[PDB]
Design an enzyme around this catalytic site. Structure first.
Site, short mmCIF file in Angstrom:
data_model
loop_
_atom_site.label_atom_id
_atom_site.label_comp_id
_atom_site.label_asym_id
_atom_site.label_seq_id
_atom_site.Cartn_x
_atom_site.Cartn_y
_atom_site.Cartn_z
N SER A 194 -5.91 -12.17 -14.59
CA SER A 194 -6.79 -13.16 -14.25
C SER A 194 -5.74 -14.64 -14.24
O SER A 194 -4.66 -14.60 -13.83
CB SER A 194 -7.84 -13.35 -15.04
N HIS B 265 -8.65 -11.06 -10.54
CA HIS B 265 -9.91 -11.09 -10.07
C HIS B 265 -10.38 -12.38 -10.14
O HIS B 265 -9.97 -13.38 -10.70
CB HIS B 265 -10.72 -10.24 -11.30
#
Ligand SMILES: COc1cc2c(Oc3ccc4[nH]c(C)cc4c3F)ncnc2cc1OCCCN1CCC(c2ccc(C(N)=O)cc2)CC1
Ligand SMILES: COc1cc2c(Oc3ccc4[nH]c(C)cc4c3F)ncnc2cc1OCCCN1CCC(c2ccc(C(N)=O)cc2)CC1
Ligand SMILES: COc1cc2c(Oc3ccc4[nH]c(C)cc4c3F)ncnc2cc1OCCCN1CCC(c2ccc(C(N)=O)cc2)CC1
Ligand SMILES: COc1cc2c(Oc3ccc4[nH]c(C)cc4c3F)ncnc2cc1OCCCN1CCC(c2ccc(C(N)=O)cc2)CC1
Lengths: 175, 196, 196, 194, 195, 176, 196, 193, 175, 176
Positions: free
Chosen positions: H96, H121
């Site tokens: 992330s 993501h």
């Protein structure tokens, strides 16, 4: 269990068997309204096994007892304390009973204060009114002078059935 | 979350942090809730600064929501007992007990930053205290004595008649820095001293 | 938060903070609740100031809501046993046990700031202590001995006889610094020594 | 809080605090509850003070509600093993285990301030212990052994018979400082030197 | 707070230390808490430093402990025996469960206890509950027995008793007074008070 | 329904004290004894007891309601009748106190608490002394033992097997 | 664990940490939520940096979600009163209260890094505050005064009329650094100074 | 427990601990969650190190599960603003927000150890935020701008088109150290010495 | 039990015994609806022992009382506070009673503010509206001036049964 | 029992929305309308509303069932009809929407929440814009107001007294 309290309600017996709150007081005033409608000359027996509770709830019960057409017998079973002692002693004169090993407690009101210093002063003003009126009423019921009521009630004062009769809380000890 | 810094002279290199430096210049900071700890911490501070030099001023910065009452009067009695004069400054806010402390500053030396607000209200009790009526009857008497004492010492430093204070403190009263000067809680509103 | 300051003489530079500096002048602060910790720390301070110099006075400041009972009598006994005189001063409040400790100061050296309040009441038990009746009869007996011991030692230091103390502490009794001098808990009310 | 103070001599400037100063003068403070930690802390203090000088006395000030049983007997066995004498002083209270430790100081050096109280009661268990009965029979037996050791070791130092101790502690027994001397737990009640 | 510091002084300099540093200075380790993963490593590191500082002098382990986990026992145990220096064990107050095994693992002749110490011996317990498929618990149950029989044979090694006996005394808890612990083979001598 | 068996048993004049003795059970049981005396004041009422104990105040509502009733009250100790349960068993009508064979009786002195001020606690303690004197006297009456032995045995819990309870006087018979 | 590092000069070896070094170069970090603790810590640092040297600029790095109101105006009034100019620099974010401060930096020295965002909204009250209506009406009146004090000081510093601020802040208004420049909240968007 | 050590020279004796020595060699450690505190610590570390010497490299060790969004972009913009090059090394994981920092190192100086993993993501919100639709419509728009800013600044450093990032981050995409190099997040996978 | 209150509904008596919330309020409006359908000329006696409660819930009961065909007798037993005082005073004139030792409490509304500065502004707008409207209504029931309702109500004003009768909350006190 | 009164009123074709509108009260309520239309499909159903609002999904269940019923639905605003209460009162059969005199009506826009990934939230947010448009359209049909005023007044809570509500179009008559 509530099947017994209904079978007894037909025989004109009711219980103040717990702490005195709006809920027990209201089911109780309703029970006295019904029972005076079915018959207004037969007495009502109110057996009391109570540690106390709200003064406001107890004045509903207390006012309702007095306006009843019929008499209210009060019986001290085990223990009738504080507001319970008040309602035992408010029973019709001559028809207040104490079982032999019951105990009666008398003391002054308790409560709390909270809020601003102006709200607390109002709270205290009612503390005094309420305190003077409940001693006056205990004074009428027991035959004692108001001075001794305020004095004995400063802190918890316990009576056995025998001493309760001398003081004026009851009129008889059942045997 | 608070740096320390280092100062230097011909005598030695000194490491201190921002509140210590402020204490070095006789500034006490009252910026938490006035509880009992806070209160001792501030008397201790007042007395030491009075010991180190009683002829040099003490300054109390105030950004506080108030606090207990016996803690209020302690700090107040110390403020008034110490020989050094006390300049009070309200940064941002001075409410309840702290608003009385702002006013009890030695006269001429009470100020507030321009967007400071000062709140005054009468003692309240946020908890509940319980007992026999004989006991609560006693607390209610002291709670009323507490209110009239806050009102006569406020009256003593603001110049208002205490009967006006009592009417104004019945409900909360918010005052902007200037409203506090007119009311008599401070003497001056700081001008920004910035060239830009 | 609590600043440090730095003092200087030709001998060296000293960094200390407001409570050490008070102690350096033989001043102990009693400002939390007298619990078991609090009591041990205060005897240790008393005993140390007795050792460092027994002929100079010790002073105890008091801003305290009171505390435990065995904790009281430890502090009390240490105060009397020590050779040095003890000045007791009440800022703001001295209640319950703490009230007894203010009166237990050496005569003539017990004082309070003017807006201090002093409260006196008989030992209470906030908890419930549970047991066979045999056991509660024993504790109940000791609780009564503790009560009369608070009342006779107050009688010794205030000049009231014990019988009044018991009438007076039946319900709590708040006294203002002035009421506290007439009662006999303190000997003087401190005047604000400030020029204004 | 608890301030520190600064001492000065021709030798140097020394900064210490009230409990360091008391330890410097061979005073150990036992003023909390006797648990396993506190007990290990005290034994280390006892053994260290025995190391610095075994011919000088160690003093234990006591304002304690008492504590566990095996914790007591560590502290007690250590007090008696050390060569240096031990003076005990009860400042506020010495209860349960602590009253045994007060009594265990070296004879003649056990004392109390005038308003101190001493409590003596037999081992209790505030918790609950559960198990198969075979497990509880074993523990119940050791609780009895522990009880009777407190009663025999209190006796060694008070001069009473263990049977008297065992009846006095059946129910708790609170004693004033003078009554603690009569009983044999301490030797003198300290007078105010002011 | 509860533990003061003291100062020692010599012609060389002034040293400030506290009761456990003075004791560590004299090769004394204190094992007085519950043996968890932390306690165990703290104790191995202390044992190994003392072996480095001087491997020809004794180490003392003071013991007042209610025990602890099993792999923490076997770590501490293994270090005591690996280190070249002799290990003197002293029980004050209590040495129970795992702690009683380490009292016995001191080097022979140098395991001792103060007279009113009690020593406790029982087989591993698991106060938690561990859950799983029957296949996993079958494995766990298996290792739990290995732990019991390993506790039983190493107890046997240092006491001179047989493991079939160790296994009987530990079926239910076995409390031993200082004297009873000497006869059992766990300590060698009971210190007499030298006042 | 569990209360369906207790009400059909009420028609057989069987009543249970099966829980800890509190105001709620005492109030239902004082109610029931009144009803059963109203239905018939000459047939016995049987009171089965399997209780660990409870409030004295609630127990004395029950006890007085037993004593004043017109009919007899038979009491049976099944399983365990302890403390206030022990008192109420022994307070049955004389001759009509039963212990089932493996029932147990526990007798000990009162428990309670103290709280409040030093003056408030003094009062609580006064009642401890009365109540304990007044309870030992009544156990001494039921069993026939001397007050002096009741007090001494009751200091710490004294257990009775159905048989020992009969020699002592708590019960009059053991059922077979 | 925040490293510490060591600097050296012909005068002595100095051990400090990243925030001390930032403070040494007069950079104050406001990177937490502005509560009263935070506000006093920042007001103290501002006042301290003005004492060491008022003719040097002070920089306030801002990566803060904002915070209470009286803390905003405490910080605000100090920043304006101090003689030193103030550089405000937004890394990452300046929301609610934090964005008034970014705008109140002295003119020309308000800047933001490129992916920094600026959020603007009108005061909210997440708790519930309770009482008799008489009291809430009072509380309510001050909440609106506070609302319009935010609209007016932002307008002073962005050049907008307050009546526009009041519309833009009715619902939250997120601005990118460039859009924050256009609004008048900052003066420049920092360009990356890398040689890569 | 984290030891401290003693290093020595002809000038004096220095006691420091393993993170101070790493800082002494211009190594910043980003090994926690990126929250607002964590971000502020790293910006000060980065800015200080640029002040001690702007012509030397800074290395960011990264074994971090990610973190907030405005704390990513403060760190990122500081990394890009500083004059010194920044070497990024992925030690364990960079997921992330943290993978964005791995990729944002200066070109050529992005690396990973061979068993490090990189997770990519699109922003998630683990909480819930409640309000009038008018207020949720605004947050929802800012959240979408945030998603696309992650997709375009990743696109700037990896060489993929922003449209693919968006296809690839719709659902989490875990990468091995080697796969991270082909994607363009790291430049080399460190060979064991 | 629950059946005591149901036997009492057969006699056209209903209780307000708890705090006034949407749940008691709705059951109570339903009960008054049924009782006006069964007989639209016989009274409904509404006994009140209530500490007070929600205005919106309370204004449902008030609106239903007023529109009902039959009269609504109100009896204050023990305590009628806040909406209890309002619903007692709102009973049909001439048929509002207080038992001898009941108490009536009158004071101003309580609530909270929360949310944005603009939402609270809206909240405070309704506070003023609500308060001015509840005061006008008490003034109609009691006959007192709006001037005196607002001022007495600023902080709690307690009335004993008699004080209430002079003030206008009730028309009678039962004996 | 409270439920015994609510059934005595069902026989008279009265149903209550006395609480928050959630799925449970909405299902009991649609069921009551199906029963009452099966018994007799020409007699009215009176819906008393004293409600603070609640779920739109549960509330559109109630709305459709009102409109699809054969019989008319008279609505009564008792004390308070806010949010979905306001919608359901105003959705009553034209001419049979009533206000009791001291009831209040509250109107405002949907409230709700967003959570999850950036894509999920985009989806949540489309439905918000749809749902917001559909409710204003419906309230604009009920009240007669332009959509432009519904949207402007509903941005923040707009309160109405019974009298103001009649001018606005939420109800048709005030009972007296
Ligand atoms: C019982 O409620 C209350 C009753 C009150 C009340 O009743 C009457 C009525 C007619 C009466 N006719 C006569 C002749 C006397 C007489 C009476 F007296 N008349 C005046 N004012 C009252 C205030 C109350 O308070 C209510 C807030 C909520 N609230 C409840 C209980 C609280 C509390 C706190 C502490 C304990 C405890 N141990 O600490 C218990 C309760 C605190 C706050
Ligand atoms: C059952 O309540 C109580 C009953 C009492 C009571 O009853 C009677 C009545 C008729 C009686 N006729 C006869 C012959 C005896 C006899 C009797 F005795 N007569 C006198 N005074 C009582 C006090 C009580 O208590 C009330 C204060 C508050 N209070 C504090 C702590 C309490 C407590 C309780 C249990 C435990 C525990 N395990 O820790 C701890 C605390 C309990 C209560
Ligand atoms: C009772 O709800 C509410 C009723 C309202 C309402 O009703 C009417 C209807 C017809 C009416 N005809 C007349 C003449 C007056 C009159 C009326 F006024 N008209 C206007 N606006 C209201 C807002 C409310 O608030 C609701 C938000 C949610 N909510 C937040 C906090 C709450 C709270 C907080 C703290 C306590 C406490 N001790 O702290 C209790 C509650 C309660 C509810
Ligand atoms: C009410 O459930 C939901 C109903 C929905 C729904 O129904 C319909 C059906 C037909 C409809 N015809 C018309 C014209 C409108 C209309 C409608 F709208 N149509 C579309 N999408 C919906 C999403 C929901 O949400 C579910 C997520 C999980 N979730 C639940 C509650 C949440 C929440 C949050 C904050 C409070 C805060 N104070 O309270 C309460 C709840 C947050 C998240």
């Amino acid at each position: 269990t509530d099947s017994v309290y209904e079978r007894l309600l037909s025989e004109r017996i009711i219980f103040l068997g717990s702490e005195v709150n709006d809920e027990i007081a209201n089911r109780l005033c309703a029970q006295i309204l019904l029972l005076a409608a079915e018959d207004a000359s037969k007495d009502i027996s109110l057996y009391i096994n109570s540690p106390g509770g709200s003064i406001s709830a107890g004045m509903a019960i207390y006012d309702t007892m007095v306006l009843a057409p019929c008499d209210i017998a009060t019986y001290a079973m085990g223990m009738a304390a504080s507001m319970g002692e008040f309602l035992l002693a408010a029973g019709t004169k001559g028809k207040r009973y104490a079982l032999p090993h019951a105990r009666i407690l008398m003391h002054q009101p308790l409560g709390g204060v909270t809020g601003s210093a102006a709200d607390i002063a109002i709270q205290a003003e009612q503390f005094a009114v309420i305190k003077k009126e409940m001693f006056r009423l205990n004074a009428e019921f027991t035959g004692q002078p108001i001075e001794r009521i305020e004095a004995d009630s400063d802190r918890d004062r316990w009576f056995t059935a025998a001493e309760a009769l001398e003081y004026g809380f009851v009129d008889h000890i059942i045997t | 979350i608070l740096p320390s810094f280092i100062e230097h002279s011909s005598f030695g290199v000194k490491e201190s942090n921002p509140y210590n430096k402020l204490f070095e210049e006789r500034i006490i900071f009252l910026g938490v809730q006035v509880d009992d700890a806070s209160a001792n911490d501030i008397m201790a501070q007042l007395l030491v600064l009075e010991s180190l030099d009683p002829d040099r001023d003490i300054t109390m910065y105030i950004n506080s929501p108030g606090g207990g009452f016996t803690s209020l009067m302690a700090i107040y009695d110390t403020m008034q007992y110490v020989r050094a004069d006390i300049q009070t400054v309200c940064l941002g806010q001075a409410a309840s007990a702290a608003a009385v402390l702002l006013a009890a500053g030695t006269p001429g030396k009470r100020m507030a930053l321009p967007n400071a607000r000062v709140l005054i209200h009468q003692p309240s009790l946020s908890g509940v205290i319980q007992g026999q009526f004989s006991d609560l009857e006693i607390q209610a008497a002291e709670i009323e004595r507490m209110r009239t004492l806050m009102e006569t010492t406020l009256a003593r430093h603001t110049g208002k008649d205490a009967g006006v204070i009592r009417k104004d403190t019945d409900r909360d009263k918010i005052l902007t820095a200037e409203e506090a000067k007119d009311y008599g809680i401070i003497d001056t509103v700081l001008e920004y001293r910035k060239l830009s």
